[PDB]
């Protein structure tokens, strides 16, 4: 199967010790974003994936070009921006909040934020199993939600990660933005969390907000955080349970988790085994700065699970 | 408020790897001090303070003080020493016993052992509404002790950190010396914990001690390690509990719990409120090498307060 | 005496090991920012600087102020903007280019190009017995434009580093801009290179460029990288030979130099004697990375010269 | 007391961050191997010890010389072989499994496997009170298996840890090997775990192991893994438990235990205090990266103690 | 123009300090081997390319393909071998010869060597324009030599690096068989140096050495270390200078001058500026740890050539 | 041949960063101190060696001893003072003076410095060919001076390094005692360079202080500086020139030179080859930290000049 995502990808410096940024002096560089992220936990599983996305004429567009290639991502349908720089982003960790990340970021004007409806390509998108995006890249530019428009439009199946951040938009935004694609778009997959079902539906309650999603979801992840993931499907209900390991950087496994269910379903993986897995590749990554770089195929996830 | 401390600053050199420093290969350097880190406590809780302390004429004395000047303290009543040099530390993490530092002092014929009465202003101590110091400033020589003694005689209110280190005196000495501080002059503020206690009193239990101590003190902050701290004050006992988070290294928690307490009195908190928020910034402090270097503001802990 | 600039300071990013950033991993933090380096470097040879700058509320505004204040410039008169984000860069070092670096930035709306004539306090300035400024000041924004004019219509005497990068500004505005400034304003100093005279008066001959300089500038400093800098005054000129050094970092080196040689001129050295002095600064400054970290005080130049 | 050991020592390379090797990019090197570790743990007690191994004519060869004489380890029974590599490997941490390690080997045809009866010297092996080794050096070779039978014949007291590694040979191969090796050679001392006693007797309960493992060794010691470990000695049992720490590298740990259990045996220490001392040895291992760098002396063991 | 190399990968572990690696305790971690080098080299300057190659079922071998696969190199040739693991050497740095390197193996039957016949398919031999081997491919095994052949004997235009390793086999076999393999093939390219051309022919004058070359090669590439190199064709020679730069590590340089120069003439370049540029590539090479992490595009080595 | 030392073995902190200590973060263990690093230059040419030196009862104590004992050094008439640190120090590399370091003493009442006549065993020291100390020795105080004082009135060969530290004791104090000792004692090598003799001789003219000093010494090394060394014997002169290589830290070199030189002697060398040969263990040094780390053999001198 193949996963065609439409975002921004990030360059990453994060923080080669925990506290606040104006005490930190060393910082350690990886490429990330949501959909970056996203197809590479897409193909670790063995499908295939593309991204659409626009970097910059600069060093950190053409790391993430090497990176994403190297990982066997299709990259063909990326656009180099002359005029713009590739986005990025730091990551202060473990401060004031232990086990937790903060992301601070420079991508405003980024080459990044300049997709457009125009970088969509119908041909292109046609030839996706599914086609998939975020709350991130509808809020970092007009162009690159139109562009989400477009591939959704184009797209016979759609998958969403709500991935909301608040310091892309106002929460009052975020709600009515994601309700309007809601509206406009019936989704395969939605993958969120109650975080954001609070933001969206007003409700915090994992059952409920899914009651309320299910009619423009077919199949509901909903992330717990460190307790696990819950899928709605069917009318069934079924909690993964996350696993105590230690903590150096949550960043990245909410995408480890969401691309990892969406590549195992189209394995043909039962829904509750393939979510069962995604908790595998998203407790493997939080135990290391990089929101990439432990990914497990999966052969690791299922060695992980014979010795826990 | 203005708080003024007296005491020996000292570099200090925190091993990159624990374990027996005979096989450490790599120090990563800090400014700390038990006065200093009291003093960056209590400004980042929106409160001024000063330090009276006595530096070499060397690159370790310059750090220190350019260190503590952009934190914000009043560092013109500090000295510089014409020949002794910079007192300095090594701290050796985890080893032998988990979770545990060790400091291994060279601080012998410091700089900081220098500081006299004769550097204690008499106008400037006026100025404060508190003046600190600890069981180390009396410890280090006959000349800081009388420091002490003068700022003591000339302060209207006074706090006191017990912080006995056995490696600088017996237990006997302690015992006499801070005995004797404490029968010649009244504390606002008596800081100490267990250990100190059964040193000082004989006594290793918390209201014990703590009635013993209030023949000395008004407010004690009696602290338990990884379990939190108990303030004693009137008639009442209050306990707030420690969190559990990943331990770098624990020194310089104990001032950090000490100095954000002090100065939240100041800021007009109740003393069970100053005692949480101080927990707060003790907890993170464990979670670092540096004494100083994630001392959270006020609004950092609330942010710690909510996310917790 | 003492020296008040206006500019921008900067989060400096630079990578741990020469060649393509997309294959550097890590990144060191330094502050830096042309009037920030100049600040520093009058300080060091025992004068009194200010700098009038914007930063944002953020870890990285925080990090400049500590910085700033720690090295004892005056931060009293910096604004904290409550929007925009501080401005950082990024540092490629020996290639394509060996010896030389490259500055990419992230700086584009940024807090620091929120500075205006409102941030200018009049008084303030007319304490100053230099008013400086760069090229780099007049190109970030309109209002950064405009808060020099401001600055200079108020300032006893003034001083200016033609400081071009074409990465924010073309030639064509960059000579145009630069020279509006000079003809409205007279100046006792003039920092500039044979590059700058090049785009500015066409004039790559720096004994030419200098006659064509020396109706808006009293004392002009021609620097000409590796190799020195020469100072015309009095209708005579002086060269001072640059020394061979292995280099780190170039970045930062100019700054040295003019920050220097300003300081010394006020502390009464000869006009000869003070470039010499301030060769030796800039000679240092390559050797490192960090654009402030090893600037010397003038007894440290003097052991240099001594043993050199 | 002497322990002299067979085996071959290596030379780690240990992942500097968790994760697959092909995202690592640095490996932090160490001096290892199983005898060797015995070898540092029983002299780190108080005992005397030697090693019989080959090494490489290379720096890793030099470089295990030079750390083993260090230690004070009599290494002038070690030989130098001018044709064969020093073997190595590198160790994969928490990956694809938290908490546990992975060791990758390149040892294939190294000078360590070319161990032979003719490196053991009938007189040398006699001065011992017992000789030791393992079923990593019964794997490695033919010739080094040979060693071990030679040495054991001429040993009046044996000692064996199963070290069973399923990339050196079949469980089949191990479990007839060993119970070869046990048939032939009555032990004093038999280290051991329920991994390894499942291999060799296809029995995981402790009691019934050691009760079957009783035939041919003396003193039995059945590891448990984190959980700690069992004594088996005169019809009698005592279990000593391990203990909860943060878990860097558990590899070494099995020989930190049973090195510093078989010296204290030879100290004259009681068997359960034995037990519970090599216990705090195997805690403290698991907390670095490096199998000896972290072993603790006898009064090292006590202060632990002593706090926990 | 299509590149074709045969040859083995190889994981680089790269001494973070100089000195002998008995006292080297980090390792920094590259892909490299000759001919992938030269792959990478050769897609820098805008041409197309692929290597026939085996590596370990391990992660050193999917470190070399993600690699590789990264930078643009068609990896569908690679093959993984069942059993043997990924050929890997270690790097010492400036001992005991400052500004050289020392390359430390492990590859004796790794999975690189095992490459044969049966992994050269004709028809894709037959679509290069170039087919590329080294003298390290014919010494590691007669499979591997086996393999050029066979390469060599399809292709019509053929290269060869003869990169003589004395750690790999005797002066007298690489003599002999590289002196066969040109009396049996005929190439276009011969890449080589004064210290392989006194090996081979006994001859370490440049001139006379491409003489005696000139009847089995058409285009002499004859490399002279830090002086540069000469290039020998149509009766004509061309003498093309090196550049003083700081020494980092010149492992992988001359393989940056190879693959740079062969992809330029097919760019259509004169084989002078060919050279010129292929210079520029070497010489970033020697400044970094790393044999492909600063290989020049041909706009950054036109960057160079214009201020230099 | 045996030397035996008498000095203070010290444990170095080397800067990991150029510039004056207040803005360098990060320390790099070695073991050092002038006796220790002749004693290791002495074995490496193949005699044997002890050292008389007293160290603390603490972990940097037992390092130098592990360290000590693991290069071949005979460590067992080394004495552990139970009530003082072993001394340290730091080094501050390249600033103010490019290619110069700078060491940062906390050696005061160090165990070293107790080094007493009490610790030096008549009948160890008569067992020496030579026995080597230095001017350090004289300083660090009176009674590891006295030690001297019964070593060398013991001894039948004597080895004087002058190794003046003016921060330990004044030119006209140090010009004193060893005039004193010069007197005292007749040396078969003093090993000395222009600096020392400035202050000793009021000469810096390598000839006339090689005249003043034979009236003490048999044969005298005369260092220059980077520039090389001269030897001074049987009314033969011989300068042996420097090389030039990349410096990263000065420290030790001298001792490199002196042990080496020293060692070579026993061997039989000709006085010429033992000072060219000395010069390369110099030149090796000066490019890393440590003053031991890369201190070559006899054979890795050769290979050096067998390419150099
Ligand atoms: N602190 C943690 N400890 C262990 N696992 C965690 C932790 N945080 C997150 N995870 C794992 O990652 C998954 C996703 O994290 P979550 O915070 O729910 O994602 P998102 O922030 O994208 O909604 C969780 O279901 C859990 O399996
Ligand atoms: N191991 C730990 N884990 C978590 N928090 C800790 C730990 N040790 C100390 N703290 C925090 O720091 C505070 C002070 O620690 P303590 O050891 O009592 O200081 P002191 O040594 O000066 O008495 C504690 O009350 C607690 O909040
Ligand atoms: N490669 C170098 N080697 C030694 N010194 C240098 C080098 N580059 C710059 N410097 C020193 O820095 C000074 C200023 O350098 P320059 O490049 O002219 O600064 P700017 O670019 O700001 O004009 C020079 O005059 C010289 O003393
Ligand atoms: N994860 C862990 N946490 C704490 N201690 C451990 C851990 N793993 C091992 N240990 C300690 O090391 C000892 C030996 O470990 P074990 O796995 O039994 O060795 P082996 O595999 O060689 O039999 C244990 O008994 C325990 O004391
Ligand atoms: N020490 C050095 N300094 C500068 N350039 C170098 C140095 N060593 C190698 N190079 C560059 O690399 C090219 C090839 O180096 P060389 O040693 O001839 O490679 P090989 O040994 O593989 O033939 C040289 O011609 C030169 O341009
Ligand atoms: N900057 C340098 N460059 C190259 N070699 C050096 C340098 N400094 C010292 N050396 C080498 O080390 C030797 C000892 O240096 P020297 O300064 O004479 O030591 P000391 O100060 O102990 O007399 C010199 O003779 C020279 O061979
Ligand atoms: O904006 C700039 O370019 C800048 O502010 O100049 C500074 C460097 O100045 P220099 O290149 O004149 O030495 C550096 O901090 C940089 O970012
Ligand atoms: O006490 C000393 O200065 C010392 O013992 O000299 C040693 C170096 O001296 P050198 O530079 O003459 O070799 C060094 O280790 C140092 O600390
Ligand atoms: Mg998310
Ligand atoms: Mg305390
Ligand atoms: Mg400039
Ligand atoms: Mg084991």
Not at 20 to 43: D, Q
Not at 120 to 149: C, F, N, P, Q, R
Not at 185 to 212: N, Q
Request: aromatic fraction near 10%; charged fraction near 25%; hydrophobic fraction near 40%.
């Amino acid at each position: 199967a193949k996963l065609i995502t439409l975002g921004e990808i990030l360059i990453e410096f994060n923080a080669l010790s925990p506290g606040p940024l104006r005490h930190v002096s060393y910082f350690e560089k990886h490429v990330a974003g949501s959909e970056a992220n996203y197809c590479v936990a897409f193909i670790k599983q063995g499908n295939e994936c593309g991204i659409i996305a626009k970097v910059g004429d600069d060093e950190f567009g053409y790391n993430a070009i090497e990176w994403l290639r190297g990982q066997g991502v299709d990259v063909s349908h990326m656009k180099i921006d002359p005029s713009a720089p590739t986005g990025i982003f730091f990551i202060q960790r473990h401060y004031p909040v232990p086990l937790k990340s903060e992301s601070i970021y420079y991508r405003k004007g980024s080459a990044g934020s300049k997709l457009s409806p125009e970088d969509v390509d119908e041909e292109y998108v046609k030839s996706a199993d599914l086609v998939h995006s975020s709350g991130i890249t509808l809020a970092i530019s007009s162009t690159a939600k139109e562009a989400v428009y477009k591939a959704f439009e184009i797209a016979s199946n759609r998958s969403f990660d709500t991935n909301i951040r608040l310091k892309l938009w106002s929460a009052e935004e975020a709600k009515r933005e994601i309700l309007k694609l809601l509206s406009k778009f019936h989704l395969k997959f939605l993958i969120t969390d109650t975080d954001d079902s609070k933001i969206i539906l007003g409700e915090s309650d994992p059952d409920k907000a899914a009651k309320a999603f299910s009619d423009y979801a077919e199949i509901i992840v909903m992330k717990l955080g460190p307790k696990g993931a819950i899928v709605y499907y069917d009318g069934k209900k079924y909690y993964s349970s996350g696993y105590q390991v230690p903590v150096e950087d949550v960043t990245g496994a909410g995408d480890a988790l969401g691309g990892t269910f969406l590549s195992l379903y189209y394995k043909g993986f039962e829904m509750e085994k393939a979510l069962d897995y995604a908790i595998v590749a998203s407790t493997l990554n939080v135990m290391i700065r990089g929101d990439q770089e432990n990914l497990p195929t999966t052969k690791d996830i299922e060695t992980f699970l014979r010795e826990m």
